[PDB]
Amino acid sequence: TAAAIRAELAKMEPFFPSGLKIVYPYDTTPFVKISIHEVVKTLVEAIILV
Amino acid sequence: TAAAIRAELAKMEPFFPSGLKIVYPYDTTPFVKISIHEVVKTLVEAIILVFLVMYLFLQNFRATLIPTIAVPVVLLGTFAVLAAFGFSINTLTMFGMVLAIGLLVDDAIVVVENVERVMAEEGLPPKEATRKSMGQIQGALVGIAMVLSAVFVPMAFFGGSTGAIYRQFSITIVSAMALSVLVALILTPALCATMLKPIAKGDHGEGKKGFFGWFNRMFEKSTHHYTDSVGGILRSTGRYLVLYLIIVVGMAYLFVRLPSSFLPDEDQGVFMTMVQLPAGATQERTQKVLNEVTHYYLTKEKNNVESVFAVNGFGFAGRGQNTGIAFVSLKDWADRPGEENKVEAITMRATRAFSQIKDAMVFAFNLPAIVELGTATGFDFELIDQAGLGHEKLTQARNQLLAEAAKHPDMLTSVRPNGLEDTPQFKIDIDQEKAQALGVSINDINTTLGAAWGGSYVNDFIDRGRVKKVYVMSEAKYRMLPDDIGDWYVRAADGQMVPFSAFSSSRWEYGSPRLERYNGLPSMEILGQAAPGKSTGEAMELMEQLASKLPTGVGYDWTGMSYQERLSGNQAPSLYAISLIVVFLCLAALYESWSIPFSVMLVVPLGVIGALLAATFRGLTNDVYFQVGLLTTIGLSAKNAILIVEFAKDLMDKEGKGLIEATLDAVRMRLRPILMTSLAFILGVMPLVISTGAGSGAQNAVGTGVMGGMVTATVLAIFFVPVFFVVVRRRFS
Amino acid sequence: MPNFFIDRPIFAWVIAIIIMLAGGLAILKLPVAQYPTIAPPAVTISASYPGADAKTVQDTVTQVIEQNMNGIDNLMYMSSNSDSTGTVQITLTFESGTDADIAQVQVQNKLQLAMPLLPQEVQQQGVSVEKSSSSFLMVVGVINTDGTMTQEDISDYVAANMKDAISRTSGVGDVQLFGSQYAMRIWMNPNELNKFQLTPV
Amino acid sequence: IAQVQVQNKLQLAMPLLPQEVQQQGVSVEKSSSSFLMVVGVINTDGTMTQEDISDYVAANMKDAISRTSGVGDVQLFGSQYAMRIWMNPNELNKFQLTPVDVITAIKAQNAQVAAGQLGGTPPVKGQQLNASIIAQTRLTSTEEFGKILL
Amino acid sequence: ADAKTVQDTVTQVIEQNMNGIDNLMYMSSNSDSTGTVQITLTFESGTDAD
Amino acid sequence: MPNFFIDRPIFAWVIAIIIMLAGGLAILKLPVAQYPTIAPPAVTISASYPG
């Protein structure tokens, strides 16, 4: 849903007037891509450790 | 739904008044009951044709009785599992049945001939003869179920509209294939040892005493003529490997030059006509054009037409006084012989006559294969009003693109707006001050103008125990011309009647008769086609580049037939590639090595050559039926190839024979089933190739590709397969 | 296995007849059609304003519906066509494979949010929501052989005594009548109205 | 399915809600109480005010974002522009008018009226021209509203 | 409201708009002098009640 | 079973690669989120009266 929202806003970006810029003050998406990355790192590390 | 509609009308029939009779000018139901009947006829004909090929090799009636009992059990079984997976008896599912017959008869012909082969070579009783016969092909048949499924199964993962078409075939063939292998171990072996008569060793039907003896002598002589020919070609492995490179290069050239069009246009017996008049045209003027159209079909096409249902004030885009339609129905398929009496030609002949029509655009066309899918016939482009420039500015922007796209006819053809051009419209200005000054309210004025010129729904009334509307509107004569506005009077507070001329000023302005809005924002539809020899993606990329040179605030988006892409050239080969990797795995598990698998991987271009050769010369394109037909020829050519290398490998491991001694002795035993397979399949798919009428379009596209493909899959593969095994056992040993 | 099937050949016949009877009952129960529903499900919204110009309807009805057409599942795109005749047609095409019934609900529910913002004229006529295909299965024409009935009379008989039951029949998503049901028409004369000092009001 | 039953029963209560509530509109949504993300919009050039950014995001951004699948509810941190008629009671009392007269005047002047069709069906046979008629159209500017005769 | 006053108004206005429905078997409407009306839509046995 | 798998060790590799490809296609098709919808479904009705 969130990646589609980023894609929606990207298509709106060239029609924005002078001054209008997008800012992200609240997001749960970065935490998702870093928690999964941290678990996959621990899973890979376990293969080397075994 | 349709049979219930016929039943509904039958119960209404006795209550109809004097004169009232039902007529059917547009129906898709007769075509359904005649396309299915034509496929079931071809399926029955294939049973008779497989029996006659079986009788030529197996002289006994009881020997031919086993595969004729084995074939129905697979076909019936497939309908049972088709109901379990939530499918239905459609053309897509039934065309899979005419493809799978060849794949199922192959598993049934290999088992019956091998029991016949061992009884004539060693002279063992049916009990032990069948047990030893199954001993060599039991691993092969389970392997066939593992290899063939791996070819068709990945064709179900395709997405969207065009994706679900391949999903119908992908399961139907695999299900029929799974049942055929299952019955080839359960029913075929038990009958081989009970129905077949025991044969004495050394006999090859040399007894003659008729015409069968001449064939048996000719076959045994040709087998020895073949084994001597295969021995000579095996010595010079070099030249034939170079010949294969010419084959694979020639295959790649024919495959890329062949055009792509999905689902062929069929003679459904019904077609339609589009009637579009200019801006400000009247119903009377449209009827004048429609009468001219109705005249043509009824006078210049008497022998083809049956019924015309012309409708005035109804079109494809929608309603309008300048739009018309004509549901044209034709006479029976048998009553219309030749290409000239087919829908394809009739529509061309109609448009040629309809092209010479003064101040009107009229063109007739056949149905786009299935319902309203029509994801083919080009592409559609949209022009979003992203900044809110207005309709007047968005028209100008659209005119700039249409002019910049028409100057390049090398990539884009027939770039036109789907919408309707701006028609002049009469603007009436009710002066607010003038109305208040005279003593007339704006509410009274608006009601007087609305109800008279536009009509007003007052309330309801009952007519013969049925609620119907009550409409208030002016008589036709008092509301036809602009000057008829002054004839209308509004009552003021002082009781005085004031005309519209006293408080209103009217003038002519320009405006859109139909405004489009795609995804909330205002839009304008642009319909176009890709130039001959150029792809849709190449035509879209140019339109995407022309839209960049367009004024600021005007955006673009692809809808319907443009939102959904054609699978072939996108992910279709990539899905045959995961099928290629999965196929390598399932055969490697049976050959117990990494080298040998490649021998059957190289038999793939041998089957494609015949499919391309047939499609190119006939004029047929790379369609769904051709692609699924290609899938059939790949699995069937591999089935013949696997059995040769299995028979050569089994004697090598289980028996004390070497490489050459194991191949020549196995290829003579395997020459009989492969010849029986092709002769039963090519003749079985022969009615489809020569077919005419309803369903013929798909019948020819499924037929020719699988027939032509089978020709090379048995002629070239019979000499190439032993060469593929001798080259792989030399490189890795 | 075949070593057990030679001693018992009846077991092979039985399971084959079981598979044959299963296919026999299948052909008799399985529905017959020419092609399967391959199309993405499209629900359509349709309103009408009596005697209203293009700009008058597209500004009123379309914009009031489109703005309330938010908070819907698996929607691909929204295409609205609106013309001078008064009629409007918003089409919501959903992802191929979605529950046609469930998808049709969300549309009507959101349409009820826009319903009090549509003018009385549009509400009186009535706005319809249907999960229908763009193609006609068949056309059932009706003619008078005796010439006792006019074009408008046949149109009314088919509407008042035929369309009712045909539209109710399951599978039928939309019925388009090629004519119109009778209505009480009051054709006003402005000269006679001005004479007696009266208005359409 | 659960969201349906709610809206269907709400339609039973809909005619018992006052016109004021019906005009504004009652919404039913199957939404979570938590925000997935917030997409703030700022003007670096200072050309746009807080109400201008609120209107741009509402009139040209919220529309498509709300339609996107998975999104159950979008909460805009501002408001879309509206024609504001800030009445002065002293000026009203002077000209002997009430808010009732102001609302009556706006309802009468800022309107879209169904005019009809010139030469429409059923026509008198021989008609050549079929054109649509345009009456009053909705006002688009503050200046247009400013000239409303009371 | 009397029988004829309701059956003509409410029933007929509902029955006519009761078109475009799935798996319906029959529609039975009872309307009496007390004012109340009752249109019953009986669907094919086994259909999703919701 | 292993007595049949020593003679045929490729069959063990094939089924393992089949299970590995099935997991490979799974990670590419399975949606990624932090937590699953554990909450009871709540539908909300919202009306407004001006001033």
Residues in chain B, overall count: 733
For B348, the 3-state DSSP assignment is helix
Print the domain residue range for B237: 212-267+560-733
| Shortest CA distance from F25: residue in chain B | B578
Where do runs of H (alpha helix) occur along B122-148? 126-147
In order of B26, B518, C101, C111, E19, the CA distances from C129 in angstroms are: 26, 19, 12, 9, 11
What is the secondary structure of B166-195 as a DSSP string?
A: HHHHHHHHHHHHHHHHHHHHHTHHHHHTTT
* A28 inside 8 A of chain F by CB: yes
Structure tokens given for B20: 């009232």
Contact C126 E17 (CB under 8 A): yes
Contact F14 B592 (CB under 8 A): no
Structure tokens given for B545: 């580049």
Q: Are residues B416 and B439 in the same domain?
A: no
**Chain centroid to CA B396: how far?**
40
Contact criterion met (CB below 8 Å) for B32 and B92: no
Structure tokens given for E7: 């059956």
B514 neighbourhood in chain C, CB within 8 Å? 54, 81-84
CA nearest to B311, candidates B346, B279, B272, B365? B272
User: Exposed/middle/buried for B250, CB within 10 Å: 0-12, 13-18, 19+?
Assistant: middle
> Quick one: DSSP state of residue D78?
S
HSE, side-chain direction, 13 A CA sphere, residue C4: 5
**Chain centroid to CA B712: how far?**
25
What is the Cα–Cα distance from C173 to C130, expressed in whole angstroms? 7
Contact criterion met (CB below 8 Å) for B562 and B540: yes
Print the domain residue range for C116: 38-132
Q: Which residues contact B538 (CB under 8 A, 6 or more apart)?
A: B411, B530
Contact criterion met (CB below 8 Å) for B324 and B337: no
Q: What angle do the packed helices C10-29 and B61-84 form, to 10 degrees?
A: 50
First vs last Cα of chain B: how many Å apart? 66
Q: Are residues B608 and B729 in the same domain?
A: yes
CATH of the domain at B485: 3.30.2090.10
CATH of the domain at B190: 1.20.1640.10
First vs last Cα of chain A: how many Å apart? 38
Contact C78 D67 (CB under 8 A): yes
Count CB neighbours of C128 within 10 A.
16
Count CB neighbours of D27 within 10 A.
20
What is the Cα–Cα distance from B452 to C185, expressed in whole angstroms? 12
* D65 inside 8 A of chain B by CB: no
Contact criterion met (CB below 8 Å) for B154 and B567: no
D3 neighbourhood in chain F, CB within 8 Å? 43
Q: What angle do the packed helices B572-591 and B624-654 form, to 10 degrees?
A: 10
What is the Cα–Cα distance from D121 to B413, expressed in whole angstroms? 38
What is the secondary structure of B297-327 as a DSSP string?
A: HHHSSTTTEEEEEEEET--SS---TTEEEEE
C167 neighbourhood in chain E, CB within 8 Å? 19-20
Question: What region does B530 belong to: left with phi over 0, alpha with psi -120 to 50, or beta?
Answer: beta
Strand B467-474 to strand B456-462: parallel, antiparallel, or no bridges (unpaired)? antiparallel
First vs last Cα of chain D: how many Å apart? 51
Q: Are residues B552 and B406 in the same domain?
A: yes
Q: Sign of torsion, CA E21 E27 E32 E34?
A: negative
What is the Cα–Cα distance from C70 to D48, expressed in whole angstroms? 27
Contact E8 B466 (CB under 8 A): no
Structure tokens given for B680: 């039963």
Contact A5 D65 (CB under 8 A): yes
Q: Are residues B705 and B592 in the same domain?
A: yes
Q: What are the residues of chain C with a beta carbon less than 8 Å away from any beta carbon of chain E?
A: 101, 126, 128, 130, 164, 167-168, 170, 172-175
> Quick one: DSSP state of residue B623?
-
What is the Cα–Cα distance from B478 to B456, expressed in whole angstroms? 16
Q: Are residues B552 and B671 in the same domain?
A: no
What is the Cα–Cα distance from B140 to B148, expressed in whole angstroms? 12
Contact B589 F14 (CB under 8 A): yes
Residue C49, amino acid = Y
Widest CA span in chain E: 38
Q: Are residues B428 and B412 in the same domain?
A: no
Q: Are residues B700 and B594 in the same domain?
A: yes
What is the Cα–Cα distance from B350 to B340, expressed in whole angstroms? 12
User: Exposed/middle/buried for C126, CB within 10 Å: 0-12, 13-18, 19+?
Assistant: exposed
Q: Sign of torsion, CA D145 D147 D149 D150?
A: positive
For B364, the 3-state DSSP assignment is strand
What is the Cα–Cα distance from A25 to C69, expressed in whole angstroms? 28
| Shortest CA distance from D64: residue in chain B | B519
What is the Cα–Cα distance from D88 to D79, expressed in whole angstroms? 24
Q: Are residues B413 and B431 in the same domain?
A: no
E strand spans, B616-682: none
Q: Which chains touch D (3 or more CB pairs under 8 A)?
A: A, B, C, E, F
CA nearest to B105, candidates B199, B10, B229, B188? B188
Residue B534, amino acid = K
Residue B1, amino acid = T
Method of determination used here: X-ray
Q: Kindly report the nearest CA distance between residue D28 and chain E, in angstroms.
A: 18
What is the Cα–Cα distance from D22 to D10, expressed in whole angstroms? 12
Q: Sign of torsion, CA B299 B305 B311 B316?
A: negative
Contact criterion met (CB below 8 Å) for B291 and B326: no
Residue A43, amino acid = L
> Quick one: DSSP state of residue C40?
P
What is the Cα–Cα distance from D24 to F47, expressed in whole angstroms? 8
Q: Kindly report the nearest CA distance between residue D146 and chain A, in angstroms.
A: 28
Contact criterion met (CB below 8 Å) for B486 and B475: no
CA nearest to B359, candidates B471, B279, B415, B431? B279
CATH of the domain at C79: 3.30.70.1430
For C44, the 3-state DSSP assignment is strand
Contact A17 D38 (CB under 8 A): no
What is the Cα–Cα distance from B423 to B470, expressed in whole angstroms? 31
What is the Cα–Cα distance from C76 to B457, expressed in whole angstroms? 37
CA nearest to B143, candidates B598, B638, B499, B537? B638
Question: What region does C51 belong to: left with phi over 0, alpha with psi -120 to 50, or beta?
Answer: left
Contact criterion met (CB below 8 Å) for B633 and B710: yes
Count CB neighbours of B529 within 10 A.
16
In order of B301, B328, B344, B355, C40, the CA distances from B349 in angstroms are: 10, 14, 9, 10, 35
What is the Cα–Cα distance from A2 to A33, expressed in whole angstroms? 12
In order of B280, B448, B718, the CA distances from B426 in angstroms are: 12, 17, 81
Where do runs of H (alpha helix) occur along chain C? 2-5, 10-29, 54-57, 63-68, 100-114, 120-125, 151-161, 163-168, 190-195
* A32 inside 8 A of chain F by CB: yes
Helix-, strand-, coil-residue percentages of chain F, each rounded to 5: 45, 5, 45
Query: Which of F27, F30, F32, F35 is best to mutate for the A interface (most A CBs within 10 A)?
Result: F32
Residue B567, amino acid = L
F34 neighbourhood in chain A, CB within 8 Å? 28, 31-32, 35
E48 neighbourhood in chain C, CB within 8 Å? 101
Structure tokens given for E47: 């259909």
What are the CB-based long-range contacts (under 8 Å, 24+) for A6-10? A8/D64, A8/D65, A8/D68, A9/D39, A9/D61, A9/D65
Contact F43 D30 (CB under 8 A): yes
Q: In what order do the strands lie in the sheet with B514-518?
A: B521-523, B514-518, C75-83, C88-94, C42-47, C128-130
> Quick one: DSSP state of residue D140?
-
* Paired strand residues for B27: C138
User: Exposed/middle/buried for B475, CB within 10 Å: 0-12, 13-18, 19+?
Assistant: middle
What is the Cα–Cα distance from B469 to C181, expressed in whole angstroms? 9
Q: Are residues B714 and B579 in the same domain?
A: yes
User: Exposed/middle/buried for B563, CB within 10 Å: 0-12, 13-18, 19+?
Assistant: middle
* C3 inside 8 A of chain B by CB: yes
Give the per-residue SS3 of B538-584. HHHHHHHHHCCCCCCCEEEEECCCCCCCCCCCCCHHHHHHHHHHHHH
Query: Which of D31, D32, D41, D62 is best to mutate for the A interface (most A CBs within 10 A)?
Result: D41
Structure tokens given for B369: 């294969």
For B333, the 3-state DSSP assignment is coil
D24 neighbourhood in chain F, CB within 8 Å? 47-50
In order of B361, B412, B617, the CA distances from B533 in angstroms are: 28, 11, 18
Residues in chain E, overall count: 50
Q: Kindly report the nearest CA distance between residue D52 and chain A, in angstroms.
A: 10
- Residue in this structure with the two tokens 């009877």, named with its chain if needed: C21
What is the secondary structure of B691-731 as a DSSP string?
A: --SSSHHHHHHHHHHHHHHHHHHHHTHHHHHHHHHHHHHHH
Q: Are residues B90 and B235 in the same domain?
A: no
Residues in chain C, overall count: 201
Residue B331, amino acid = K
Structure tokens given for B83: 């109901």
Q: Which residues contact C124 (CB under 8 A, 6 or more apart)?
A: B457
B386 neighbourhood in chain A, CB within 8 Å? 15
What is the Cα–Cα distance from B290 to B285, expressed in whole angstroms? 9
Structure tokens given for B2: 């349709």
HSE, side-chain direction, 13 A CA sphere, residue B701: 23
* Paired strand residues for C42: C93
Phi–psi pair at D109, nearest 5 degrees: -95, -45
> Quick one: DSSP state of residue B123?
-
* B4 inside 8 A of chain E by CB: no
- Apex F42 CA angle, F39 and F43, nearest 5: 155
Contact C112 D112 (CB under 8 A): no
CA nearest to C129, candidates C143, C117, C113? C113
For E39, the 3-state DSSP assignment is strand
Q: Which chains touch A (3 or more CB pairs under 8 A)?
A: B, D, F
* D41 inside 8 A of chain E by CB: no
CA nearest to B721, candidates B613, B606, B611, B589? B606
Residue C24, amino acid = G
Q: Which chains touch B (3 or more CB pairs under 8 A)?
A: A, C, D, E, F
Closest partner CB to D6 (pick from F39, F43, F47): F43
In order of B168, B519, D21, the CA distances from D25 in angstroms are: 46, 22, 6
- Apex F38 CA angle, F35 and F42, nearest 5: 125
- Residue in this structure with the two tokens 């509400």, named with its chain if needed: C123
Tell me whether the omega of the peptide bond preceding residue D122 falls within 30 degrees of 0, making it cis.
yes
Contact criterion met (CB below 8 Å) for C42 and C78: no
* Paired strand residues for B505: B429
User: Exposed/middle/buried for F21, CB within 10 Å: 0-12, 13-18, 19+?
Assistant: middle
Query: Which of C168, C174, C175, C181 is best to mutate for the E interface (most E CBs within 10 A)?
Result: C168
Closest partner CB to D68 (pick from A4, A19, A29): A4
- Cβ-count burial B308-318 (b if 16+ within 10 Å, e if not): bbbbbbebeeb
CATH of the domain at B356: 3.30.70.1430
F51 neighbourhood in chain D, CB within 8 Å? none
Contact D39 A15 (CB under 8 A): no
- Cβ-count burial B440-467 (b if 16+ within 10 Å, e if not): bebebbbbbbbbbbbbbeeeeeeeeebe
Phi–psi pair at C75, nearest 5 degrees: -75, 135
| Shortest CA distance from D4: residue in chain F | F43
What is the Cα–Cα distance from B68 to B64, expressed in whole angstroms? 7
Contact C113 D69 (CB under 8 A): no
Phi–psi pair at B25, nearest 5 degrees: -90, -10
* Paired strand residues for B328: B271, B308
What is the Cα–Cα distance from B622 to C154, expressed in whole angstroms? 49
Q: Are residues B564 and B538 in the same domain?
A: no
What is the Cα–Cα distance from B124 to B127, expressed in whole angstroms? 8
Q: Kindly report the nearest CA distance between residue D86 and chain C, in angstroms.
A: 24
What is the Cα–Cα distance from B98 to B707, expressed in whole angstroms? 12
Helices vs. strands in chain C: H and E counts, helices first: 9, 6
| Shortest CA distance from D46: residue in chain A | A19
In order of B118, B315, B364, the CA distances from C194 in angstroms are: 110, 40, 51
Contact A11 B555 (CB under 8 A): yes
Q: Alpha-carbon Rg of chain E, whole angstroms?
A: 13
What is the Cα–Cα distance from D22 to B419, expressed in whole angstroms? 36
**Chain centroid to CA B226: how far?**
41
C107 neighbourhood in chain D, CB within 8 Å? none
CA nearest to B674, candidates B648, B637, B646, B645? B637
> Quick one: DSSP state of residue D107?
H
What is the Cα–Cα distance from B408 to F24, expressed in whole angstroms? 45
Closest partner CB to C73 (pick from D4, D23, D69): D69
Query: Which of A20, A24, A27 is best to mutate for the D interface (most D CBs within 10 A)?
Result: A20
* Paired strand residues for C83: B514
Q: Which chain B residues in 285-304 lie under 8 Å from chain E, judged by CB atoms?
A: none
Q: Kindly report the nearest CA distance between residue D59 and chain A, in angstroms.
A: 12
> Quick one: DSSP state of residue B197?
P
Q: Alpha-carbon Rg of chain D, whole angstroms?
A: 23
Contact criterion met (CB below 8 Å) for B621 and B698: no
**Chain centroid to CA B427: how far?**
51
